[PDB]
Amino acid sequence: NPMREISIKKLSIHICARESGAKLDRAAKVLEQLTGQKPVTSKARMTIRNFGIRRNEKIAVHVNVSGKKAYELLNTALRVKEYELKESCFSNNGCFGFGIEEHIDLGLKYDPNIGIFGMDFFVILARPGDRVSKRKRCKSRVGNKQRVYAEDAKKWFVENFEGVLVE
RNA sequence: GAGUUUGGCUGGGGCGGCACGACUGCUAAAGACUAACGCAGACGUCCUAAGGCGGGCUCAGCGGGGAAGGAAACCACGCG
Numbered sequence A: 001n002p003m004r005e006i007s008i009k010k011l012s013i014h015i016c017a018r019e020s021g022a023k024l025d026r027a028a029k030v031l032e033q034l035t036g037q038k039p040v041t042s043k044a045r046m047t048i049r050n051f052g053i054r055r056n057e058k059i060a061v062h063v064n065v066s067g068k069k070a071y072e073l074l075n076t077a078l079r080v081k082e083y084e085l086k087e088s089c090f091s092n093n094g095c096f097g098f099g100i101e102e103h104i105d106l107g108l109k110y111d112p113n114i115g116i117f118g119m120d121f122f123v124i125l126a127r128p129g130d131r132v133s134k135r136k137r138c139k140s141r142v143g144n145k146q147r148v149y150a151e152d153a154k155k156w157f158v159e160n161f162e163g164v165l166v167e
Numbered sequence B: 001g002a003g004u005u006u007g008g009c010u011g012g013g014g015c016g017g018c019a020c021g022a023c024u025g026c027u028a029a030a031g032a033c034u035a036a037c038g039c040a041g042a043c044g045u046c047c048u049a050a051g052g053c054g055g056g057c058u059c060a061g062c063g064g065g066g067a068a069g070g071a072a073a074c075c076a077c078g079c080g
Helices: A022-034 A069-079 A150-160
Strands: A007-015 A040-043 A058-065 A084-086 A095-098 A121-126 A164-166
Touching (some): A007 A069, A069 A121
Antiparallel strands (some): A007 A121
16 A cells, blocks of 8 residues: 555646747746756647737747656745645646746746746646556556545645645 | 632530540449430649658547636647
């Protein structure tokens, strides 16, 4: 039963500097300085005039981090929300997330050349043995006795931060 | 002023159309062949990759999530 502990699988952060160009590289230096890795850009699938986007250009930037590096990034962003989350943000399969409004609450000092950006945090939990569906030889399906669920993920949250479940 | 020519198919001929070379499905009666100015369409091009080969991946769509974000922006999990 040490093979049944829940843990942070992967953490995702991304900013939508809507129309590409000069506003991108301001954000692209934020994610690098906050985490420490170069981020990745994203293209638009189709062209929309009501939003003002073409079919091939940048819209957003994101980055995926793991390990113990992601465990402490998750601690700093939660304190900005007083260590409390809405109860309806948890999903069927052990995932939850939230959005940070203003860039300068977590860290990085102002530098008025950049601006203030919003973030988006998403978290994925899991137990060991998840590799059996990601590998190459003998790819398979996990099994229900593993497979973190919603209420299994709530009570993981009130044990590592002493949070509170609104609503 | 001289010599000569001014196609064919066709429910008569002419006007119109091309069933005049040629591809796909049906008419066609469970091997192949099989008619009508029968039905529904397409051809006289286009491509230095839209050709050849190695490697890595999964598509249309649905379900639960995420600051401004809405019917439609992007991230991402579970199925397909």
